[PDB]
Amino acid sequence: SGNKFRMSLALPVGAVMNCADNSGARNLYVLAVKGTGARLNRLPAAAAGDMVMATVKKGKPELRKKVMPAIVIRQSKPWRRRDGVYLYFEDNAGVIVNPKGEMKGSAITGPVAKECADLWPRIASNSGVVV
Amino acid sequence: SHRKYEAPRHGSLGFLPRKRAAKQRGRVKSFPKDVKSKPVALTAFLGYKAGMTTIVRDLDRPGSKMHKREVVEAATVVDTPPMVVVGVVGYVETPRGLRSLTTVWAEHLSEEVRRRFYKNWYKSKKKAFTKYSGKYATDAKQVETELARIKKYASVVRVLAHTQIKKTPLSQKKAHLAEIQINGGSVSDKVDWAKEHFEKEVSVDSVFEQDEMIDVIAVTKGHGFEGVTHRWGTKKLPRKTHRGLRKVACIGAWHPANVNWTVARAGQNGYHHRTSINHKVYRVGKGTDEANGATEFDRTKKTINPMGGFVRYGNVNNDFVLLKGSIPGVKKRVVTLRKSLYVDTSRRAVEKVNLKWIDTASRFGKGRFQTPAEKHAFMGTLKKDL
Amino acid sequence: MKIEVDSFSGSKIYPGRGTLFVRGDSKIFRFQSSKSASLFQQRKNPRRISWTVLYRRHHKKGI
RNA sequence: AAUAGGGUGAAGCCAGAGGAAACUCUGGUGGAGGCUCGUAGCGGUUCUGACGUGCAAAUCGAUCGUCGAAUUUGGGUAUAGG
RNA sequence: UAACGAGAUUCCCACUGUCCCUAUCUACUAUCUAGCGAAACCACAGCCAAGGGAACGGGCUUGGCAGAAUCAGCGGGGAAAG
RNA sequence: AUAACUGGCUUGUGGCAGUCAAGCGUUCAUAGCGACAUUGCUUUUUGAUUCUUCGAUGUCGGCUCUUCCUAUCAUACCGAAGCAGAAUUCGGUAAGCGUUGGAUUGUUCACCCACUAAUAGGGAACGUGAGCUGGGUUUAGACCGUCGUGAGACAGGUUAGUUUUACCCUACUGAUGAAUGUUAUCGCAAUAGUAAUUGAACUUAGUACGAGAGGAACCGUUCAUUCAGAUAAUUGGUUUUUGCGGCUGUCUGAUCAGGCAACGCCGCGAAGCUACCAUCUGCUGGAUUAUGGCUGAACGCCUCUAAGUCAGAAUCCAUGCUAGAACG
Ligand SMILES: O[C@H](c1cc(C(F)(F)F)nc2c(C(F)(F)F)cccc12)[C@@H]1CCCCN1
Ligand SMILES: [Mg+2]
Ligand SMILES: [Mg+2]
Ligand SMILES: [Mg+2]
Ligand SMILES: [Mg+2]
Ligand SMILES: [Mg+2]
Ligand SMILES: [Mg+2]
Ligand SMILES: [Mg+2]
Ligand SMILES: [Mg+2]
Ligand SMILES: [Mg+2]
Ligand SMILES: [Mg+2]
Ligand SMILES: [Mg+2]
Ligand SMILES: [Mg+2]
Ligand SMILES: [Mg+2]
Ligand SMILES: [Mg+2]
Ligand SMILES: [Mg+2]
Ligand SMILES: [Mg+2]
Ligand SMILES: [Mg+2]
Ligand SMILES: [Mg+2]
Ligand SMILES: [Mg+2]
Ligand SMILES: [Mg+2]
Ligand SMILES: [Mg+2]
Ligand SMILES: [Mg+2]
Ligand SMILES: [Mg+2]
Ligand SMILES: [Mg+2]
Ligand SMILES: [Mg+2]
Ligand SMILES: [Mg+2]
Ligand SMILES: [Mg+2]
Ligand SMILES: [Mg+2]
Ligand SMILES: [Mg+2]
Ligand SMILES: [Mg+2]
Ligand SMILES: [Mg+2]
Ligand SMILES: [Mg+2]
Ligand SMILES: [Mg+2]
Ligand SMILES: [Mg+2]
Ligand SMILES: [Mg+2]
Ligand SMILES: [Mg+2]
Ligand SMILES: [Mg+2]
Ligand SMILES: [Mg+2]
Ligand SMILES: [Mg+2]
Ligand SMILES: [Mg+2]
Ligand SMILES: [Mg+2]
Ligand SMILES: [Mg+2]
Ligand SMILES: [Mg+2]
Ligand SMILES: [Mg+2]
Ligand SMILES: [Mg+2]
Ligand SMILES: [Mg+2]
Ligand SMILES: [Mg+2]
Ligand SMILES: [Mg+2]
Ligand SMILES: [Mg+2]
Ligand SMILES: [Mg+2]
Ligand SMILES: [Mg+2]
Ligand SMILES: [Mg+2]
Ligand SMILES: [Mg+2]
Ligand SMILES: [Mg+2]
Ligand SMILES: [Mg+2]
Ligand SMILES: [Mg+2]
Ligand SMILES: [Mg+2]
Ligand SMILES: [Mg+2]
Ligand SMILES: [Mg+2]
Ligand SMILES: [Mg+2]
Ligand SMILES: [Mg+2]
Ligand SMILES: [Mg+2]
Ligand SMILES: [Mg+2]
Ligand SMILES: [Mg+2]
Ligand SMILES: [Mg+2]
Ligand SMILES: [Mg+2]
Ligand SMILES: [Mg+2]
Ligand SMILES: [Mg+2]
Ligand SMILES: [Mg+2]
């Protein structure tokens, strides 16, 4: 439920990002990106605000070894906003959510990209500083 | 056997051959279709690509996430001094296409346009158009007769106009002479307009209005001989491939026992003729105005020129056109600006542009000042200032 | 449009110029170019960098 | 006839500490080994690199094995086509 | 089975243009010039489609067509060369 | 004269498609199927044969790239239903346009994970090795198991094993060019090519439909995927600007200023080049296919059809875009 402009992709398949919620996961390993079409040899890749299918590589045992949705909330790859500003964070981070985009955990450490907060009201609810 | 996996074509088959343009001046392949009920007006203009800049603009697009909010946008500056009308051509509809019937010229042609007809001007006697200038002897009824022939027989009337390249910073002294089709009114009206405009200047503000969508005809940047990887964007072969990797591995099946016209091959890249459409006019600036770069919100008396001039062009001291985005060609390239070939009523086409601010920092580096006065105020007195 | 100030060198940032850096503690730094951006990621001290405005004010030059 | 410079630190030897004894523990010294890192040297793993009508009828470059012995090598000498 | 291994294999950390997905730079070539100057190969040669044919033609039959002389590349064909 | 590839005849076998209509489908042969039979097509399987090649046509697979077929997976438009809606199934015109990222295996094949509108099937000497690679097979080294007295065999397992040449002709991609009095400028347009693609969100609307559960669509708006053509504002990358600064060793007696370290090293670094790693741009008319119709006979009724005619698909031809016939 939103229409975000194109952003520089930061997280190809196989990337491991930080998990920024208190759900108990410490890693989030990207294995797919929602909405990725077909192109030979091209890896699916995610930007901030993208829904991703991920597994927990490092974390609580009941969160590990499962496929689960997650939403990327910040990226260290610089990207340009329509107001001309190129910005980036120190790391790539995401949060575990439902297929509907509703967070499983209930608290986010660190800033959240405005594209993600504008696009996911739940993450906006659980977010502190929004950039 | 079939491809193991499917993939789209590399490159467009609608732009073959990828060869050099026959001329450096891009030529208008097609002019806007003539409607008699409109007034008599030019349909194209010639200008010179000066450089690119940046603007800030409030977007007026309801339903957008940037609506009523500032956007930062790239813009292109086209130096466009007024063109001089020197001739008129009549065209006749024939079962083989349009055919030029007659060309009538003005009595006096300027030196920059008379240089167009010479390869070695300094070695010439400069005899061009002297007997034709004599054709005007005291009644010029032969000339009116040719104009009457155009009125009687021509169906398409085009004017001959040349740029005043001496008003630009270019070191070239040859003017650029082009045919610009006249639309509107009857053929007699078009011929009368051309005659009354012989040896007169026509400005951009008489051809293009603000918020228009216009097309740009130009020859692109030349890159010389280029391989398939950058000419056609094909996949590089693995690192460990013998005899090199910037190639297309299979250039054909065994049969047909020939190389097909559709296989990507190394060859000349760039310097192609392109027509790029739907570039919005953000500003038709005036050369006499000392506040070219000023807006209604930034009243700093400021020209469009960056500090130190446009890099590898110079200063734009003439009337100019500020276009949205990028246009084909390089700096100093002659660019043909053509009116649109259709009527666009989309919100992007009918939006009214109001500029907030125009970037005039140096393009020769990471410029951080908009004006020498601002630079002085920021840095204070220097040793060289005494 | 408003003009920002470089967190490192203190020079004016005009629309579209430079980059914005969000630190892990949610603090925002603005750099006009890759020069000050590189010195910032290189951990340089603007009080010890002779050309910044902060340096000039620390040494009371042009005041 | 030839084989930089380091590391490790075996026997043998000297001294101290702890105890009734049995003895144990510790600090030095010493300089062993078909030991080890690594030059010269000998070899030739990988790039399946270069070259591949070559510089060369086997070479070139990087990388690599080994480098005090079952080591490397000159000359003299012996063994000759079932 | 400790130790050892340019032996074969799997996983993990670090690392990276291996890759997403490519871009840029340097020297030597290639290129052009003066001088010097080979070789493989060669029935005759050299545009296609279909047909028939030793059942996949440069030549034959029927069509498409077809305008001197050429340069850099290239690797579809010459069922190319060895 | 004769096997192991391709190709050729054949098409048993493999694959695909008909017709008949006993039954299935609460009733009901034919919405969807369809036994017993029977007629075909294909050469993407495997056989049969041995016609070409043994003075050699480089024999697996993958990577890369182009094109073609349609027996259509998706997308456009439609007809049918055991089609209320949503979903789905059967069918028509249709190849314009797309058909993916990975774990294991040398694999073709397979099998899972995941995205997607969809992850359709094939051909081009089982496309493609002077394009690559060389994991497999299929020289010579070696090990094992079974077999053999043995040398040795295995279509069984395992490990290591040189992949040569284009400068010729043609063809493709670009680049010049004699002559059609000379030279110059501006043009026309025959012919050839062609380009865009798909999704999501908001609204319609919790509306139509439905007892409820559930639950659409057209007009419109904002974005996005894949592709295409440019461009260098900005941001990033690149650095022989060896531009500026810094650092080690050594050399010029010291200083200043320099040389060398097979660009000595490091930070920044303009300009240039360049990135869905950046930005911009990607048109509107006509004629039709399937199909649904009008008037209207044949056949005093009926009938979209016989004469005539209307609308109508991602189709076709133009508009537009690229080249410009080097003998228009
Ligand atoms: O040992 C030679 C040899 C054979 C073969 C093979 F038959 F397998 F293809 N390949 C060889 C190769 C090969 F190309 F690597 F396969 C290299 C050197 C000698 C080879 C033989 C000896 C008998 C005469 C033919 N060459
Ligand atoms: Mg792949
Ligand atoms: Mg296919
Ligand atoms: Mg295609
Ligand atoms: Mg280049
Ligand atoms: Mg190789
Ligand atoms: Mg610049
Ligand atoms: Mg930079
Ligand atoms: Mg030693
Ligand atoms: Mg040893
Ligand atoms: Mg050793
Ligand atoms: Mg050595
Ligand atoms: Mg060697
Ligand atoms: Mg080799
Ligand atoms: Mg060679
Ligand atoms: Mg001897
Ligand atoms: Mg050994
Ligand atoms: Mg094993
Ligand atoms: Mg033929
Ligand atoms: Mg035959
Ligand atoms: Mg045949
Ligand atoms: Mg044959
Ligand atoms: Mg034949
Ligand atoms: Mg022949
Ligand atoms: Mg003939
Ligand atoms: Mg030639
Ligand atoms: Mg070649
Ligand atoms: Mg060939
Ligand atoms: Mg021959
Ligand atoms: Mg056969
Ligand atoms: Mg059959
Ligand atoms: Mg059968
Ligand atoms: Mg029944
Ligand atoms: Mg045979
Ligand atoms: Mg026989
Ligand atoms: Mg033969
Ligand atoms: Mg043979
Ligand atoms: Mg032969
Ligand atoms: Mg051969
Ligand atoms: Mg061959
Ligand atoms: Mg074979
Ligand atoms: Mg069909
Ligand atoms: Mg269908
Ligand atoms: Mg097609
Ligand atoms: Mg076949
Ligand atoms: Mg084959
Ligand atoms: Mg080949
Ligand atoms: Mg080969
Ligand atoms: Mg092969
Ligand atoms: Mg092998
Ligand atoms: Mg063997
Ligand atoms: Mg036995
Ligand atoms: Mg093997
Ligand atoms: Mg080996
Ligand atoms: Mg045409
Ligand atoms: Mg609603
Ligand atoms: Mg491009
Ligand atoms: Mg220096
Ligand atoms: Mg020094
Ligand atoms: Mg010296
Ligand atoms: Mg030296
Ligand atoms: Mg030096
Ligand atoms: Mg840099
Ligand atoms: Mg730069
Ligand atoms: Mg777009
Ligand atoms: Mg009727
Ligand atoms: Mg009909
Ligand atoms: Mg009819
Ligand atoms: Mg002709
Ligand atoms: Mg011509």
Q: Is the peptide bond before A111 cis (omega within 30 degrees of 0)?
A: no
Disruptive mutation site among C4, C23, C25, C26 for chain A (greatest number of A CBs within 10 Å): C26
Q: For residue B274, which of B326, B325, B328, B230 has the smallest C-alpha distance? A: B328
Subunit contact B72:A40, Cβ cutoff 8 A: no
Backbone angles phi, psi at B150, to 5 degrees: -60, -45
Nearest to A82 among B6, B7, B66 (CB): B66
Helix (H) or strand (E) holding C39: helix C34-41
Subunit contact A91:C24, Cβ cutoff 8 A: yes
Q: In a 3-state reduction of DSSP, which class is residue A116?
A: helix
Q: Is the peptide bond before B256 cis (omega within 30 degrees of 0)?
A: yes
The Cα–Cα gap between B266 and B223 comes to 12
The Cα–Cα gap between B41 and B339 comes to 11
Pairing of strands B273-285, B320-324: antiparallel
| Radius of gyration over every alpha carbon of chain C, rounded to an integer in angstroms | 12
| CA count, 13 A, side-chain hemisphere, B5 | 6
Contact, B312 vs B331, CB < 8 A?
yes
- Look-up of token digits 């200047």: B201
C13 touches chain A (CB under 8 A): no
Is A14 marked as a binding-site residue? no
Residue A79: CB atoms within 10 A of its CB come to: 19
- Which region, left, alpha or beta, applies to residue B262 given φ > 0 means left and ψ of -120 to 50 means alpha? alpha
Contact, B273 vs B219, CB < 8 A?
yes
Q: What are the residues with a C-beta under 7 Å from any atom of nucleic chain D?
A: B 240, 242-243
The Cα–Cα gap between B188 and B148 comes to 8
Is A126 marked as a binding-site residue? no
Residue B116: CB atoms within 10 A of its CB come to: 16
Interface of A with B in 60-99 (CB under 8 A): 82-85
Residues with CB under 5 A from ligand 6 (ion): B 242
Query: Cα separations (Å) of B43 from B69, B158, B159, B179?
Result: 35, 10, 10, 10
Subunit contact B54:C1, Cβ cutoff 8 A: no
Query: Cα separations (Å) of B79 from B83, B165, C33?
Result: 12, 10, 30
Subunit contact B72:A84, Cβ cutoff 8 A: yes
The Cα–Cα gap between B66 and B72 comes to 11
The Cα–Cα gap between A10 and A97 comes to 20
C1 touches chain B (CB under 8 A): yes
Q: In a 3-state reduction of DSSP, which class is residue A75?
A: coil
A5 touches chain B (CB under 8 A): yes
Pairing of strands A16-19, A93-96: parallel
Query: Cα separations (Å) of A110 from A46, B161, B376, C26?
Result: 19, 64, 41, 6
Residue type, A76: S
Distance in Å, CA B131 to ligand 48 centroid: 72
- Look-up of token digits 């030019």: B42
Using CA atoms of C44, C46, C52, C56 in order, give the dihedral in degrees to the nearest 10. Answer: -150
Question: Nearest C-alpha of chain A: how many angstroms from C52?
Answer: 23
Residue type, A46: A
Q: Please name the method used to determine this structure.
A: cryo-EM
Angstrom resolution of this structure: 3.1
The Cα–Cα gap between C3 and A98 comes to 41
Contact, B162 vs B83, CB < 8 A?
yes
Subunit contact B71:A83, Cβ cutoff 8 A: yes
The Cα–Cα gap between B234 and B256 comes to 22
The secondary structure of chain B, three-state, reads CCCCCCCCCCCCHHHCCCCCCCCCCCCCCCCCCCCCCCCCEECEEEEEEEEEEEEEEECCCCCCCCCCCEEEEEEEEEECCCEEEEEEEEEEEEECEEEEEEEEECCCCCHHHHHHHCCCCCCCCCCCCHHHHHCCCCCCHHHHHHHHHHHHHCCEEEEEEECCHHHCCCCCCCCCEEEEEEECCCHHHHHHHHHHCCCCEECHHHCCCCCCEEEEEEECCEEEEECHHHHCCCCCCCCCCCCCCCCCCCCCCCCCCCCCCCCCCCEEEECCEEEEEEEEEEEEECCCCCCCCCCCCCCCCCCCCCCCCECCCECCCCCEEEEECCCCCCCCCEEEEEECCCCCCCHHHHCCCCEEEECCCCCCCCCCCCCHHHHHHHHCCCCCCC
C23 touches chain A (CB under 8 A): yes
Is the shortest CB-to-strand distance from A45 to strand E under 7 Å?
yes
Q: Which residues of B touch C33 (CB under 8 A)?
A: 366, 368
Interface of C with B in 4-63 (CB under 8 A): 11-12, 14-17, 32-33, 35, 62
The Cα–Cα gap between C13 and B127 comes to 58
Distance from residue B2's CA to nucleotide F38's C1', rounded to whole Å: 37
Six token digits for residue B66:
């940037």
Nucleotide closest in space to A44 (CA vs C1'): F101
The Cα–Cα gap between B333 and B313 comes to 10
The Cα–Cα gap between A60 and B377 comes to 60
- Look-up of token digits 């001329």: B23
The Cα–Cα gap between B43 and B194 comes to 13
Which strand D nucleotides have any atom less than 7 A from protein CB atoms?
47-50, 52
Residue type, B57: R
DSSP one-letter code for A121? H
DSSP one-letter code for A13? T
Number of B/C CB contacts below 8 angstroms equals 30
- Look-up of token digits 């004010």: C57
The Cα–Cα gap between B77 and B284 comes to 10
Subunit contact A84:B66, Cβ cutoff 8 A: no
